[PDB]
RNA sequence: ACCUAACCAGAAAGCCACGGCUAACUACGUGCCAGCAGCCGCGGUAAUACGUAGGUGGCAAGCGUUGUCCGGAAUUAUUGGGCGUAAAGGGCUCGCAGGCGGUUUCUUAAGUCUGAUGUGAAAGCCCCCGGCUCAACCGGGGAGGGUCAUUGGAAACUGGGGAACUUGAGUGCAGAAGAGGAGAGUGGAAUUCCACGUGUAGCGGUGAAAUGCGUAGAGAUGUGGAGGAACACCAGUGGCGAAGGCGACUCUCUGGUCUGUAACUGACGCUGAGGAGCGAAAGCGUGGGGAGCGAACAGGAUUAGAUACCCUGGUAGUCCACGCCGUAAACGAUGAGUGCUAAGUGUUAGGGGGUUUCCGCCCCUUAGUGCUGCAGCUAACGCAUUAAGCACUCCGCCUGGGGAGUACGGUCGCAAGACUGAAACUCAAAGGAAUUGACGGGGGCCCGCACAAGCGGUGGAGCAUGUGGUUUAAUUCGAAGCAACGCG
RNA sequence: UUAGCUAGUUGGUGAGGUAACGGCUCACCAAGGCGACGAUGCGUAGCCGACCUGAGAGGGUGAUCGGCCACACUGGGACUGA
């Protein structure tokens, strides 16, 4: 680029995409706009429990169902752990991080959040899977 | 010139021992390939290697490569004379002259080469290719092009130590 | 044509600087003249003998680089671009090379050298840079 | 708060990781299930990757996950990227604005640079000390931060102004050359068709045929006439043009290029977004022209199928004039201008010359164009004085692929569409060059009961054995292209 | 993928007004003015000292302390007073 060319036409920008849709909010009393505020984790009333097919060549049974978030969007999140007290009509707290196998997990619900239950019968790493302290004794 | 003889204690660091296979009738005849650079600890630091059947074989052909060539690298006490952006082979190297206690801040092939070739404070952050052979190539050309101040006064006839600072 | 004269002289001393030629021509001007006395007095080329005549020109310098490949003209760069001009204040007059080369900033009292211009302590248009 | 005495080690340690990146390893269970995951990717009965247990490693009253910002990111590049093939040269020109500009000389300070004052408050960043037991922190003492004003200098460089000069560029003078263009006219060779002679049973086409034509007299051959389109030989990696492109011959009107001294002018130049203009072939409107060729269409062939290849026909179109269309692998996938940098060998268009009336050889010289190659460039192929080398001026383009040149919006178009031109989602690959092998119904060379050349068989008949299958209480297991089947 | 905009607008004269010049507001006159050096229009947003990050150039935010502007349920209005 010439000094007159780049000195008159300018340099184009490098705008990249976001890592996950978590708008913040929108707050609809009363506009319903209403983003971005981009919270650390959105917590919404769940949609349906289930299990989808993993992507090839992985052949397992990941179980993750949709979550009507507390702002309006509905992105399906693959819930962490083995064992889940999350059923239909129960709310969960979605947290970020794209899943690998099944295409389109725009959240990973915090196993240990307000509505959901923690990983039971697991004690080697408990920040993830949210279980309490170790067995007594 | 001149080709410095193998007449010192060599360091013999290994840069990286890559795999290699010629896709022939029957699979791929796998042979190890390692470009590991030997260093004299004073300035004779030369970096070329070959291939062989075993990992120790690649050590042997690499050490034969270190007995092949050596470089000078004239630098007065933890520096180079002129910190020149030296890269030849599509892989740059940006090695400036640093202070006394500023450390040898270089990368993979730069930290191996200058780290085994007598460096005290030469800041280096590359700009370009990232192959191993390209790193030792452009780093070897840059180390083999940086000029020394006494000889730079002794070949361009102005004065020795007339350019100080 | 004639985009910049000093870039034509610098391209002359560069291209002849790699050609291994004995003498080198130039377009004779006040920049080739004062730059010939500066770059000849600092000891790169053997001698500039400005053989003038009608109508214009024409300088003629000899490459003062011996057997050893790359003599006192070891590499030159346009530090000032006629078209987007360099500038250098007193404290910001940069000495090119670090310890080997020398830069030539066209000071307000004559086309100085690097260390001599810092001796005056006044900068100007960065005229050329001979690494 | 802090101090003093007593008391008790008594109450005071967890979180993440242990393939790589990346410090940190083994066992049990699980057996593509449950799972992990930032990327690479693991997990289908020996998991350093899933959980569990010991141990290790990082960190610490904290440790991980996620959200956002910076860096890595030379992945917007002024520092500091590029465009022949990877993404990227505008199809090409003319030009306004803008951006840049030959050498000498006087002035100027508008930029350029420097000194003095004002001001850039505090707190904060950095340097130098002191105070809270030290530290975080506080306080004091400094610094630095401006196209900043006002003002003093230098005049080197860019600019303002005046004087100049000539190679740049232009005019002149004389040469040379060409399918450069526009209009008019003319000429043949060949095909078709028509008229008549001559003559018979085929002509035609193909891989092989058929459709088609021919006893209403075809093909062929002789003569003559009509009409359209293109001009063979010269003709050639020749010439000219901005490019697309341009070919029979002649004339009118016209542009441009190069050579040569050198009369004049004295920088009057280079690029140039918009804007203007031209731009193959297909198309589009009207009106002409329709000999050959010939999409769509018809028939026959080849194939399992033939909305194709082939053949026989055949509309539009090709042609012309007037207007619109404004795309192409519009290619050298290389924008224009200028300066420099090894050489050889062609080839037109000129010039100077060495002797040469000649002619002709040879050198020097331009301009244009082709090959072969040094330095240098590069990812490799390759380029290389016609650079992709070496530097300067300016314009245009490029920022992973798909989505997608798609949608929506505008401009133009009679339309056909052209220009401009996104996004959501998704993926870690697309891509360029080069190597090794494979393939080929690609070519080259060769060999063998491979083929050809002969003998005698099998597949037909009854029987012997094995296999498949069906049956069984079981018809034991193993072999399944040659290499399983008179096999173990 | 905003090329049009503007009619108290552009300018004059005159009068009134406020602490004060001024189309600030009116009468009369003229037809102006802004725009590729981006007008207008959509969008977003308090700005700065500074903070965070980067080797540096730069990139991002305007918390807490301070400086200025704005607002005080929404939208106008004027009185008291310096």
Curated annotation (Swiss-Prot), chain A:
One of its GO terms (biological process) is translation. PROSITE patterns: RIBOSOMAL_S12 (PS00055). Residues 32-54 are annotated as: Disordered. One of its GO terms (molecular function) is structural constituent of ribosome. It comes from the Bacteria. The keyword Ribonucleoprotein applies. The record marks 101 as: Not modified. Keywords: Antibiotic resistance, Ribonucleoprotein, Ribosomal protein, RNA-binding, rRNA-binding, tRNA-binding. Pfam families: Ribosom_S12_S23. One of its GO terms (cellular component) is small ribosomal subunit. With S4 and S5 plays an important role in translational accuracy. Interacts with and stabilizes bases of the 16S rRNA that are involved in tRNA selection in the A site and with the mRNA backbone. Located at the interface of the 30S and 50S subunits, it traverses the body of the 30S subunit contacting proteins on the other side and probably holding the rRNA structure together. The combined cluster of proteins S8, S12 and S17 appears to hold together the shoulder and platform of the 30S subunit. Part of the 30S ribosomal subunit. Contacts proteins S8 and S17. May interact with IF1 in the 30S initiation complex. Interacts with BrxC. Many streptomycin resistant B.subtilis with mutations in this protein produce increased quantities of a natural (but uncharacterized) antibiotic. A number of substitutions and deletions can promote streptomycin resistance, dependence or pseudodependence; all but one of these (K55R) are associated with hyperaccurate translation. PANTHER family: 30S RIBOSOMAL PROTEIN S12 FAMILY MEMBER (PTHR11652). Belongs to the universal ribosomal protein uS12 family. This is Small ribosomal subunit protein uS12. The gene is rpsL.
Curated annotation (Swiss-Prot), chain B:
Belongs to the universal ribosomal protein uS5 family. It comes from Bacillus subtilis (strain 168). Altered S5 proteins have been identified in a number of mutants. Some mutations in S5 have been shown to increase translational error frequencies. GO terms for molecular function: rRNA binding; structural constituent of ribosome. The N-terminal domain interacts with the head of the 30S subunit; the C-terminal domain interacts with the body and contacts protein S4. The interaction surface between S4 and S5 is involved in control of translational fidelity. Coiled coil: none annotated. Residues 10-73 form the S5 DRBM domain. Disulfide bonds: none annotated. It comes from the Bacteria. This is Small ribosomal subunit protein uS5.
Curated annotation (Swiss-Prot), chain C:
PANTHER family: 40S RIBOSOMAL PROTEIN S15A (PTHR11758). One of the primary rRNA binding proteins, it binds directly to 16S rRNA central domain where it helps coordinate assembly of the platform of the 30S subunit. One of its GO terms (cellular component) is cytosolic small ribosomal subunit. Part of the 30S ribosomal subunit. Contacts proteins S5 and S12. Keywords: Ribonucleoprotein, Ribosomal protein, RNA-binding, rRNA-binding. One of its GO terms (molecular function) is structural constituent of ribosome. Pfam families: Ribosomal_S8. The gene is rpsH. Belongs to the universal ribosomal protein uS8 family. NCBIfam families: PRK00136.1. The lineage of its organism: Bacteria, Bacillati, Bacillota, Bacilli, Bacillales. The keyword Ribonucleoprotein applies. PROSITE patterns: RIBOSOMAL_S8. GO terms for biological process: translation. Gene3D superfamilies: 3.30.1370.30, 3.30.1490.10. InterPro entries: Ribosomal_uS8 (IPR000630), Ribosomal_uS8_CS (IPR047863), Ribosomal_uS8_sf (IPR035987). This is Small ribosomal subunit protein uS8.
